[PDB]
């Protein structure tokens, strides 16, 4: 359902959000225009997802409904649960960030929001 390889097309408030969560500026300025590749492999409730941003690789894993440990952008790993809000939506909270991943056909739309910052990424199947 979710599986596939996707690249970012566009994103909103990368800089603002990454500062707020403590991404080191050095990595902000490099990664701000990288159109990153996300790779998803779903097997029923079981998901594995890789997020590559040049030379940075974040490999994560979770079963829906179950507790998981998600390595975040800074490197911090948080304990949380990811849930389906439908077949097309994946949904979670970590580090007070609300996260919504929406698949429509070939388009994955990810929104992360901390307080009033809404970090939105639009990715296309590749
Ligand atoms: C090792 C040097 C490479 C520098 C790369 C900078 C990393 C910037 C972060 C890219 C944004 C990707 C955030 C992932 C969000 C998500 O997976 O849902
Ligand atoms: C590195 C930040 C952790 C990712 C936060 C959400 C984890 C649960 C679901 C994974 C879906 C992420 C889809 C990536 C699409 C994208 O790169 O924008």
């Amino acid at each position: 359902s979710f599986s596939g390889k996707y690249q970012l097309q566009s994103q909103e408030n990368f800089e603002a959000f990454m500062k707020a969560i403590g991404l080191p500026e050095e990595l902000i300025q490099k990664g701000k225009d990288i159109k990153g590749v996300s790779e998803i492999v779903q097997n029923g409730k079981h998901f594995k997802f890789t997020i590559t941003a040049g030379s940075k690789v974040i490999q994560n894993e979770f079963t829906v409904g179950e507790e998981c440990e998600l390595e975040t952008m800074t490197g911090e790993k948080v304990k949380t649960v990811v849930q389906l809000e439908g077949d097309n939506k994946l949904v979670t909270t970590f580090k007070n960030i609300k996260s919504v991943t929406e698949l429509n056909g070939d388009i994955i739309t990810n929104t992360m929001t901390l307080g009033d910052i809404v970090f939105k990424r639009i990715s296309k199947r590749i």
Side-chain angles (χ1 to χ4, degrees), residues 14 18 27 31 34 51 53 55-56 73 110 112 121:
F14 178 80
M18 285 309 170
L27 301 156
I34 286 156
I51 299 156
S55 145
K56 172 75 133 172
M73 210 50 205
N110 202 264
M112 284 169 142
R121 281 165 70 82

Side-chain angles (χ1 to χ4, degrees), residues 8 11 14 17-18 23-24 26-29 31-38 49-58 60 71-74 94 99-101 108 110-112 119 121 123:
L8 190 76
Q11 74 193 321
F14 178 80
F17 177 93
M18 285 309 170
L23 219 267
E26 245 135 290
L27 301 156
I28 297 185
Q29 298 305 297
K32 65 185 204 152
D33 295 289
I34 286 156
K35 302 294 178 294
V37 178
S38 304
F49 69 106
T50 321
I51 299 156
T52 303
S55 145
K56 172 75 133 172
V57 179
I58 300 174
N60 269 299
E71 173 177 344
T72 66
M73 210 50 205
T74 53
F94 52 81
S99 190
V100 175
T101 310
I108 263 169
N110 202 264
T111 316
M112 284 169 142
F119 175 37
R121 281 165 70 82
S123 308

Side-chain angles (χ1 to χ4, degrees), residues 9-29 31-88:
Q9 303 293 296
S10 64
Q11 74 193 321
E12 295 188 49
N13 305 315
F14 178 80
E15 286 212 14
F17 177 93
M18 285 309 170
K19 188 176 101 143
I21 59 109
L23 219 267
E25 244 289 291
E26 245 135 290
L27 301 156
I28 297 185
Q29 298 305 297
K32 65 185 204 152
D33 295 289
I34 286 156
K35 302 294 178 294
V37 178
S38 304
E39 288 178 46
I40 307 198
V41 180
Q42 172 182 353
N43 180 51
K45 305 180 65 192
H46 300 106
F47 300 66
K48 285 158 173 193
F49 69 106
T50 321
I51 299 156
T52 303
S55 145
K56 172 75 133 172
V57 179
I58 300 174
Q59 177 62 228
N60 269 299
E61 99 196 321
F62 62 94
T63 304
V64 158
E66 304 300 351
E67 171 169 288
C68 63
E69 186 181 41
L70 301 181
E71 173 177 344
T72 66
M73 210 50 205
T74 53
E76 194 178 349
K77 302 186 185 167
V78 303
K79 304 289 182 39
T80 175
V81 189
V82 197
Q83 312 255 196
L84 296 153
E85 251 182 53
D87 272 36
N88 85 314

